[PDB]
Paper text:
Coronavirus spike proteins mediate receptor binding and membrane fusion, making them prime targets for neutralizing antibodies. The spike protomer can be divided into an amino- and carboxy-terminal region designated S1 and S2, respectively. Distinct S1 domains mediate receptor binding, whereas S2 comprises the fusion machinery. In HKU1 and OC43, attachment to 9-O-Ac-sialosides occurs through a well-conserved receptor-binding site located in spike protein domain S1A.
Single-particle cryo-EM analysis of spike protein ectodomains of HKU1-A strain Caen1 yielded a reconstruction for the unbound state at a global resolution of 3.4 Å. Compared to the HKU1-B model, our data allowed building an additional 231 residues per protomer. Among newly built segments are the membrane-proximal connecting domain (residues 776–796 and 1152–1225) and the linker between the S1/S2 and S2′ protease cleavage sites (residues 878–907). We could also model a major portion of S1B2 (residues 480–575) such that this subdomain—purportedly crucial for protein receptor binding—is now fully resolved in the context of an intact HKU1 spike trimer, our findings essentially confirming the crystal structure of a HKU1-A S1B-C fragment (residues 310–677)24. In addition, 20 N-linked glycans per protomer were built, all well supported by the density map. Several glycans are engaged in interprotomer contacts (for example, N1215), among which the S1B N355-glycan may help stabilize the HKU1-A spike trimer in the closed conformation by contacting the clockwise neighbouring protomer via Y528. HKU1-A spike is largely shielded by glycans leaving only a few regions exposed, most notably the sialic acid-binding site in domain S1A. Predictably similar in overall arrangement, the apo structures of A- and B-type spike trimers differ in the orientation of their S1A domains, with those of HKU1-A tilted outwards. In the starting apo state, each S1B domain is held in place, wedged between the S1A and S1B domains of the anticlockwise neighbouring Y-shaped protomer. Of the two observed protein–protein interfaces, the one with S1A buries a larger surface area (1,207 Å2 versus 442 Å2).
Residue numbers in the entry:
A (entry chain B): 14 to 376
B (entry chain C), E (entry chain B): 1040 to 1150
C (entry chain B): 765 to 984
D (entry chain A): 267 to 748
F (entry chain C): 819 to 984
């Protein structure tokens, strides 16, 4: 369950229909996947080392594109489908084309991003409408079991993923268009210091800037909503849905630019030894030679923590809060040894005002 | 060579005006604000030591190359043949020479 | 793919013969037919002469930087002095090489170098420059043309590159940026045309009488 | 440069900056230097004009109208307004508000006038008088550790001011959806009472601050209050045991409060810090004190107002002027559409093929512009950069014309000096005399063009041969004296 | 030589712990009080780079002088005459040699 | 990345400003080692210029001709000159000093599993300072010197101007 509002209970099965499948797909950054354009930079025919929020090469994608016809299972609204949004995600979406009455119809999944998913915390919603990308972020009163339908062919149910009879007061609401006759779309979503960022690309694998919204809080979980259409899963001869998501990380990338300013290649710079050789050489095809690679300290396998057994309490609070406070002419002194103390409790119980140190720190 | 490597190893335990010569004590006593200046002092001192070491290594390797060129001429002119150069191979009246392998060089036995 | 093998770059040549004296006689392979072969070798005599100044490199055109550099001005004086003595040593070495190219050289005045160039059936036309009496402009030989066209960054190349720097439409050149940042390669005190003329004079004196560079005897 | 004789009387003086010969004398620290070739630096070509480019008329930011608003919030919920595509006067803004102090870190006062920024981020909250000293940089106080963290690695400006005590309302509203989910209403505090949080706690999404009613029915000694939180939430970790004198004693987690919990590891709510650009995570609710006694799957989970704790409040009044904090966050320095107009300068069209200083929308420096026609700029792409952080061309905002920025000439001049001659034999290497004449300086001495460059104060007679020169300039050319 | 000059040019874009590698951004962001420590860091780093470069240049030019002395001996003993030194001019049975000019050096063709 | 900053993230992040110094240091050491390798190759090549051996050379039995003993100077006496061609004379030289290239290899080998802590080579190797073996092993150079000596010994007397040694 993703919300707390009970909208409806039609066509639901919960009799342990346990067939969840998460597909995998290796991440190939070596042609421009997961790379975005800098906001005001043009580089021509050069190779630049750049650090940014990037997907990790050699990892795996994750196909969260659910698909249903009538039934809504209860296993579609828990982990691992209700996934983890810790720093940010990079998305790769298939653009499903439906040919109804010799007319193109593009439709794919709807992604929601939030923290708690109730109507006192904001929720970023991205939802297409036949080539128009609606990106809104308000306090949506989303249902316990969300739902998305197919505009080209109506399914057995109506669309029901929020109960906002009146538009809630909020911050961001905008419309975006794109080339509706495309095959794959790429999305960068990440957050940094309380501001939510978003990058977009439709034609070409490198990504460009879209917008940036400030929220004031953090994002915790994202979820790809299930879609219900009838012309898609018709005897599995037609097309399907592919929504591939990978987590983001702050790692150095090596990028290559051509004469037009388009990113042609990318290197992870930390995936393997070969990538590290490429990033040290600042090229993609280094000359024949022997290279020495450092950073080869063996990782520890365990931790040992030794303390002397149970020692009496120091009672620093009981001496500091004594009722006989002396003058600076005769300052007192009490030496503490062979005793354990809690610094947080000691700071809390006495009515402190300031506590600073020199040549040493608090942490 | 052993003394040079030992001196370079002992360069790692110099304070350079920092509170500690080891990065573990500094990173366990300071938190990224006053730690940075001490780490900068350590880095600058160690980089100066490395630059001095590589300059001295360059000079030493140049001397080694000159000695090896002398060894090549000694092989060419004293062992395989006998060029008419007085007191080039050995002191006194020279007869011939033989070459034997040595650790980091050759061994010439002038007769 | 990657094969891990032993590295044996040098080995001896074997001859199937006895190693004992039978009948008071040994066995050895005396050659019966011969040829003349050649081999080239390049020895580096000169190096580019680089000059660096603090008042462009460390602080380009800023008053505060130049004022703060006044404390460390002894370092800049030492750097300029060290580079000056380095370039002086290079110039002295070039002068010594040019002098030792012609020690006991002696040429003939009646030497019209364009028509009499290959006597005793040996061609020195490619090795001898300025064929004729007009040896004032360029004495570079035909042999040196391949050498000086294979590499374009000679002293003349540096001069032509620094010349084509004030007015142009190209920005990716490194030499202009280096020269604007105080790093510049000055031409040597002797141009390579003069050294080519010296080598040509040495070769001709080795060939034609009086055979100064060939111990007073015909070359063949 | 001064010279003293044996009596201490100054006999000679050198200007050290009048001419090349004086500079040679001052470098040599003598008056008659030996014969040699000297290289003189400090030969960057002076700019001939200035080009200053600004975006045309943008609306006023009205920073004063937002700073002097009559609804000042708490440090618990600090407001933020982002300013872009607007022009502002810093002096008028500082003057009209009743400022007291305005200091900045990693950036200064004098470089704000006539400068461009991508955006200006401003945060505002009232200062309680007890925690006034908490706002100092690097101090880990209750304001800096639970309400508002001040970044120290970003170019920021701190502003202190005050509004009159009347016409002031205090907006108290905690931005914690977790606290609002389990029954937290508005505050009940007097006017000019500024509330700040002392500890912030973060929980997971599946939190539920109530006990299981089925387990609550079995608990007969110290039975906790029970309710019914919505689905997807795991209940409390209350478990029953025997304390060797009671048949059934059941204890719960976070006894008695998350602040003073003897076992914080098993407690779900954890004490947390706050990052820059983020609000407080929440208020640690007392688990046992809140709830409904004997609630069996019929009452949703709610908690009392007094259950939430870990905050104290004070007042803003100081000599009848409530002091207000402000924090300028300047990002995108020397680039962007938000420029200051205190150093007012009319817009100047871009010149071509002349060394000029430029102010192209915040980017400063000097260079030579050569206009070209290249269309690799996209809608967002607007500046062309070299491979390591160097501007090498841009495209104008209004005219959409592609330009390239080339560096100005910064060569050196040689000087051949002989002891018997009081003049100099100059040499501008790799130049032509026409470029030296009109673009560098006029010639008061006979100039000629040679292979090495343009020679000054030395006639061109390269036909004679000299076998010994003490003044060699290179490539077989020497400058003797006669 | 081109790589050495390129490395010295790339030394100009190092932060050395300062806020910016360029003096223009520092002088346009700080005013003569905290600017001075950044400018001192840049100056010290660039002076260290220059000292390392001139030491390496001294070593390289010494090697060049040694090679040029070898070239002078090669001209004196193999081209103008034939000293009885085995395998000094060329490998195998030497006959004579000729000298031709080369970019930054001479070219010997041993026959 | 081992000497200046061993395994600490803050030190490695601060070292990124001075990364050009590290690239220059590694490049200088690389060209120094390349010059050393070229010099070793030139010495190995000039050890054999006009050398010529005989195939019918069973060096285990004919080793002392003309009443002169070269058994100690000549290695791999016999036809098994594939394993170790080191001569008896070089045994004293290579046993008087133990820290040769083989000594360095055997010392760095005995570094992972051991009960000794006062050795300096293990500490140096863990702190990024390591002495790599040369591109030619001393066994090959010993075989080269043996080949030169035997060429001086027996017909055809390549290293002794084509004449008997006595
Ligand atoms: C913000 O979200 C909360 C949480 O969902 C909303 O409160 C919930 O509102 C719904 C209907 O508005 C309530 O459902 C009702 O339940 C009674 C129970 O007898 C039933 O008879 C009604 O027909 C209806 O289904 C629900 O109880 C209530 N509370 C919870 C915990 O879900 C709130 O309305 C939302 N606010 C806005 C402005 O949308
Ligand atoms: C883009 O950069 C490449 C690489 O520097 C350029 O290719 C070089 O072109 C020059 C022509 O002057 C050749 O001498 C080099 O050998 C080329 N190098 C390589 C690796 O190909 C290419 O010319 C540049 N393109 C443009 C339009 O300037
Ligand atoms: C963004 O575009 C979409 C599609 O054109 C808009 O959705 C329609 O809005 C109209 C009202 O303007 C409604 O009558 C339709 O029912 C909507 N269509 C669907 C499929 O919901 C949307 O309103 C636009 N958003 C904004 C902010 O202009
Ligand atoms: C001996 O002298 C005769 C002179 O008649 C040489 O013959 C000439 O050789 C040149 C080669 O440089 C040819 O171009 C001429 O055509 C030859 N002339 C005649 C008439 O044969 C001959 O080369 C000399 N011998 C040697 C070995 O050089
Ligand atoms: C202060 O800002 C204003 C606009 O925000 C600048 O523009 C002037 O505005 C006044 C009225 O607000 C007009 O009367 C003037 O004609 C405007 N232009 C000029 C050139 O004064 C104003 O210039 C700014 N102040 C300063 C000192 O630059
Ligand atoms: C410079 O380029 C910008 C970016 O395209 C132009 O701004 C828009 O251009 C499109 C088509 O070029 C017009 O339909 C819009 O009306 C323009 N926007 C506005 C607000 O006018 C801009 O017009 C270009 N400048 C020119 C052509 O002088
Ligand atoms: C430069 O000055 C020197 C020093 O006076 C000149 O050398 C003198 O010349 C005069 C006249 O010929 C002689 O009487 C002196 O005996 C010379 N002194 C010495 C120490 O040589 C020199 O001639 C001047 N001119 C040049 C071109 O050097
Ligand atoms: C400095 O040099 C530049 C070019 O090298 C000169 O610019 C041109 O000068 C010619 C000669 O009068 C004019 O016909 C052109 O119109 C000029 N071009 C431009 C773009 O202005 C420039 O005049 C020189 N400086 C001076 C003061 O003469
Ligand atoms: C500098 O002087 C030389 C020597 O006279 C000049 O070279 C002569 O130039 C004229 C005119 O082009 C030619 O007819 C002669 O043949 C050249 N002689 C030689 C020996 O080269 C040179 O042109 C002069 N330079 C300037 C700028 O006046
Ligand atoms: C001359 O030849 C005879 C061959 O008979 C050599 O005599 C042999 O010398 C070897 C020493 O290498 C001894 O081991 C043999 O026992 C000798 N055999 C006989 C039959 O005497 C003799 O050494 C040769 N002369 C010289 C000066 O070497
Ligand atoms: C949710 O609502 C549906 C109709 O909208 C209703 O049939 C169902 O009983 C509700 N679920 C509850 C009350 O748990
Ligand atoms: C969709 O809404 C219509 C509106 O009347 C309703 O008749 C229909 O039953 C709904 N579909 C469902 C609940 O699946
Ligand atoms: C949309 O993408 C398709 C993909 O092949 C391309 O052919 C088409 O030209 C694009 N549309 C536009 C308007 O560029
Ligand atoms: C010996 O060297 C020659 C030339 O380098 C080579 O052709 C031959 O194969 C070598 N013999 C070996 C490696 O046994
Ligand atoms: C040397 O030649 C002889 C005569 O043909 C032959 O008997 C002998 O086997 C050869 N030895 C070799 C090829 O090693
Ligand atoms: C030597 O070789 C040449 C060609 O290589 C040939 O013409 C000539 O007849 C040969 N002479 C002998 C004696 O073999
Ligand atoms: C500049 O002119 C010189 C002739 O002095 C020429 O060799 C060079 O190629 C020119 N440069 C360019 C980029 O054309
Ligand atoms: C403050 O409020 C009083 C009473 O409402 C009013 O008279 C006064 O003008 C107000 N001051 C301001 C600055 O608005
Ligand atoms: C809030 O404060 C006012 C004034 O002190 C008081 O009259 C009122 O009862 C308080 N509200 C509650 C719920 O106690
Ligand atoms: C909270 O969730 C995190 C994963 O986001 C998990 O690692 C942790 O154990 C959870 N803690 C509690 C008390 O549920
Ligand atoms: C380690 O093993 C090597 C053999 O490879 C041996 O020479 C050396 O003495 C051993 N080290 C010790 C301390 O015994």
């Amino acid at each position: 369950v993703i919300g707390d509002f009970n909208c409806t209970n039609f066509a639901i099965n919960d009799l342990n229909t346990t067939i969840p499948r998460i597909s995998e797909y290796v991440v190939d950054v070596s042609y421009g996947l997961g790379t975005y354009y800098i906001l005001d930079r043009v580089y021509l025919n050069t190779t630049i080392l750049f650090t940014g929020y990037f997907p990790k090469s050699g990892a795996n994608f994750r196909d969260l594109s659910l698909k249903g016809t009538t039934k809504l299972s209860t296993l579609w609204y828990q982990k691992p489908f209700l996934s983890d949004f810790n720093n940010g995600i990079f998305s790769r979406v298939k653009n499903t084309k439906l040919y109804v009455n010799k007319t193109l119809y593009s439709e794919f999944s709807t992604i929601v991003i939030g923290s708690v998913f109730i109507n006192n915390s904001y929720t970023i919603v991205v939802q297409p409408h036949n080539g128009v990308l609606e990106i809104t972020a308000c306090q949506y009163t989303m249902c316990e079991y969300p739902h998305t339908i197919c505009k080209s062919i109506g399914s057995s149910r109506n669309e029901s993923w929020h109960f906002d009879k009146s538009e809630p007061l909020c911050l961001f609401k905008k419309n975006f268009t794109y080339n509706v006759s495309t095959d794959w779309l790429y999305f960068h979503f990440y957050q940094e210091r309380g501001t939510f960022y978003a990058y977009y690309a439709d034609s070409g694998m490198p990504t460009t800037f879209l917008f940036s919204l400030y929220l004031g809080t953090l994002l915790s979980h994202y979820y790809v909503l299930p879609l219900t259409c009838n012309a898609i899963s018709s005897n599995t001869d037609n097309e399907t849905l592919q929504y591939w998501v990978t987590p983001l990380s702050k790692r150095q990338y090596l990028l290559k630019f051509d004469d037009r300013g388009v990113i042609t290649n990318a290197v992870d710079c930390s995936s393997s030894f070969f990538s590290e050789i490429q990033c040290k050489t600042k090229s993609l095809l280094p000359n024949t030679g022997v290279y020495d690679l450092s950073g080869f300290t063996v990782k520890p396998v365990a931790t040992v923590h030794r303390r002397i057994p149970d020692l009496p309490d120091c009672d620093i609070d009981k001496w500091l809060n004594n009722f006989n406070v002396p003058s600076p002419l005769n300052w007192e002194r009490k030496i503490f040894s062979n005793c354990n103390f809690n610094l947080s409790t000691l700071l809390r119980l006495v009515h402190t005002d300031s506590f600073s140190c020199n040549n040493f720190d608090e942490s | 060579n052993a003394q040079a490597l030992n001196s370079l190893l002992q360069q790692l335990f110099n304070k350079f005006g920092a509170i500690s010569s080891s990065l573990q004590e500094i990173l366990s006593r300071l938190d990224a604000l006053e730690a940075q200046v001490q780490i900068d002092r350590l880095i600058n001192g160690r980089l100066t030591a490395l630059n001095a070491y590589v300059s001295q290594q360059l000079s030493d390797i140049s001397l080694v190359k000159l000695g090896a060129a002398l060894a090549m001429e000694k092989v060419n002119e004293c062992v395989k043949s006998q060029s008419p150069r007085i007191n080039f191979c050995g002191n006194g009246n020279h007869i011939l020479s033989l070459v034997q392998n040595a650790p980091y060089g050759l061994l010439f036995m002038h007769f | 793919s990657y094969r891990f093998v032993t590295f044996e770059p040098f080995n001896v040549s074997f001859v199937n013969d006895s190693i004992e004296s039978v009948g008071g006689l040994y066995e050895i392979k005396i050659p019966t037919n011969f040829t003349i072969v050649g081999q080239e070798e390049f020895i580096q005599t000169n190096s580019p002469k680089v000059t660096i100044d603090c008042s462009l490199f460390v602080c380009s055109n800023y008053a505060a930087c130049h004022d703060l550099l006044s404390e460390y001005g002894t370092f800049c004086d030492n750097i300029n002095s060290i580079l000056d003595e380095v370039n002086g040593l290079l110039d002295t070495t070039q002068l010594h090489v040019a002098d030792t190219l012609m020690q006991g050289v002696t040429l003939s005045s009646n030497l019209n170098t364009n028509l009499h160039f290959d006597v005793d059936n040996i061609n020195f036309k490619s090795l001898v420059g300025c064929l004729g009496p007009h040896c004032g402009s360029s004495s570079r030989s035909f042999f040196e043309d391949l050498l000086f066209d294979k590499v374009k960054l000679s002293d003349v190349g540096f001069v032509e590159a620094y010349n084509n720097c004030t007015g142009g439409s190209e920005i990716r050149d490194l030499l202009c940026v280096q020269s604007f940042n105080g790093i510049k390669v000055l031409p040597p005190i002797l141009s390579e045309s003069q050294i080519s003329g010296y080598t040509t004079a040495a070769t001709v004196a080795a060939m034609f009488p009086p055979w100064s560079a060939a111990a007073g005897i015909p070359f063949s | 440069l001064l010279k003293f004789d044996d009596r201490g009387v100054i006999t000679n003086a050198v200007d050290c900056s009048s001419s090349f010969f004086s500079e040679i004398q001052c470098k040599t620290k003598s008056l008659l230097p030996n014969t040699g070739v000297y290289d003189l630096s400090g030969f960057t070509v002076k700019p001939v004009a200035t080009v200053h480019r600004r975006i045309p008329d943008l609306p006023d930011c009205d920073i004063d109208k937002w700073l002097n608003n009559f609804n000042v919030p708490s440090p618990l919920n600090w407001e933020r307004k982002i300013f872009s595509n607007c022009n502002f006067n810093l002096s008028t803004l500082l003057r009209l508000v009743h400022t007291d102090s305005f200091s900045c870190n990693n950036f200064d006062e004098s470089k704000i006038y006539g400068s461009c920024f991508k955006s200006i981020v401003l945060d505002k909250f009232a200062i309680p008088n007890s925690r006034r000293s908490d706002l100092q940089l690097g101090s880990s106080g209750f304001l800096q550790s639970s309400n508002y963290k001040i970044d120290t690695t970003s170019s920021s400006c701190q502003l202190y001011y005050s509004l009159p005590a009347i016409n002031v309302t205090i907006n108290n509203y905690n931005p914690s959806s977790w606290n609002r989910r389990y029954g937290f209403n508005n505050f009940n505090l007097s006017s000019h009472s500024v509330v700040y949080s002392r500890y912030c706690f973060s929980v997971n999404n599946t939190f539920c601050p109530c006990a299981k009613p089925s387990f609550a029915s079995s608990c007969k000694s110290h039975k906790p209050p029970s309710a019914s939180c919505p689905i997807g939430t795991n209940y409390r970790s209350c478990e029953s045991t025997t304390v060797l004198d009671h048949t059934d004693w059941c204890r719960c987690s976070c006894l008695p409060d998350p602040i003073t919990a003897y076992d914080p590891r098993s407690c779900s709510q954890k004490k947390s810090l706050v990052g820059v650009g983020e609000h407080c995570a929440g208020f640690g609710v007392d688990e046992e004190k809140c709830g409904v006694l004997d609630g069996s799957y019929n009452v949703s989970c709610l908690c009392s107002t007094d259950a939430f704790l870990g905050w104290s409040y004070d007042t803003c009044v100081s000599n009848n002027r409530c002091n207000i904090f402000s924090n300028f966050i300047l990002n995108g320095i020397n680039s962007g559409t938000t420029c200051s107009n205190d150093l007012l300068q009319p817009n100047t069209e871009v010149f071509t093929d002349v060394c000029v200083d430029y102010d192209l929308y915040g980017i400063t420096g000097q260079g030579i512009f050569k206009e070209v026609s290249a269309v690799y700029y996209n809608s967002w792409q607007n500046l062309l950069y070299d491979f390591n952080g160097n501007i090498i061309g841009f495209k104008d905002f209004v005219t959409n014309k592609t330009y390239n920025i080339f560096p100005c000439y910064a060569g050196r001049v040689s000087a051949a000096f002989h002891q018997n001659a009081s003049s100099l034999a100059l040499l501008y290497r790799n130049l032509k005399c026409s470029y030296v004449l009109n673009n560098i300086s006029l010639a008061t001495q006979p100039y000629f063009d040679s292979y090495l460059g343009c020679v000054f104060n030395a006639d061109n007679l390269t036909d004679y041969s000299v076998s010994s020169c003490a003044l060699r300039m290179g490539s077989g050319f020497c400058v003797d004296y006669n």
